[PDB]
């Protein structure tokens, strides 16, 4: 089933991340265009995902890469700037504008 982001991401979607929090499936897609962020969640009454949250391309024009460890959406913007976000409501928690991080990797001895 193809779901089109042509009505929200007019310049192509750049990064996609999928998780399972709050008894849902938050699929956060970061791209450039009318809306920088699109949060798709599966509709329980239908067959497909619908948009639940939208962030305009005003402060951040888009997301290049995501990494969702747990309740922490580390968002790398189009300016190679890393930031810390809370996935529950997408509120600004932290920002890292001093470090021009082209790519960031988070590694830990994961047990649970």
């Amino acid at each position: 089933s193809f779901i089109s982001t042509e009505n929200y991401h007019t310049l192509g979607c750049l990064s996609l991340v999928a998780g399972d929090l709050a008894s849902e499936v938050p699929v956060i897609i970061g791209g450039t265009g009318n809306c920088a962020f699109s949060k798709w969640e599966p509709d329980s009454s239908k067959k497909g995902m619908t948009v639940k949250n939208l962030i305009d391309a005003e402060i951040i024009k888009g997301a290049k890469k995501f990494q969702l460890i747990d309740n922490l959406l580390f968002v790398l913007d189009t300016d190679n700037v890393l930031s810390l976000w809370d996935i529950y409501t997408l509120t600004p928690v932290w920002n890292w504008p001093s470090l021009h991080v082209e790519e960031f990797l988070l590694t830990t001895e994961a047990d649970s």
């Binding site: 639940k52 939208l54 402060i59 509120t91 600004p92």
Partner: protein, 74 residues
């Protein structure tokens, strides 16, 4: 704040008010997030502060009104 200089004898269908005033309103959710972030940053010891060289003093909470302009319902 303008002077009428055209004559319109046609019938216009519109409604008008005779004493209604807009009271307190709510800020946009995107605007509210910026202020919530500013409050969070102003009271964070891990900020590279530009005007304060001391640990930040705690203050009673901030609550920004939201107009629910997003499908959050907030």
């Amino acid at each position: 704040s303008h002077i009428e200089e055209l004559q319109s004898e046609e019938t216009a269908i519109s409604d008008f008010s005779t004493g209604e005033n807009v009271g307190p309103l709510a800020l946009p959710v995107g605007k509210a997030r910026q202020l919530i972030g500013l409050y969070t940053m102003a009271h964070n010891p891990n900020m590279t502060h530009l005007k304060i060289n001391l640990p930040v003093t705690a203050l009673p909470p901030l609550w920004v009104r939201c107009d629910s302009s997003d499908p959050e319902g907030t």
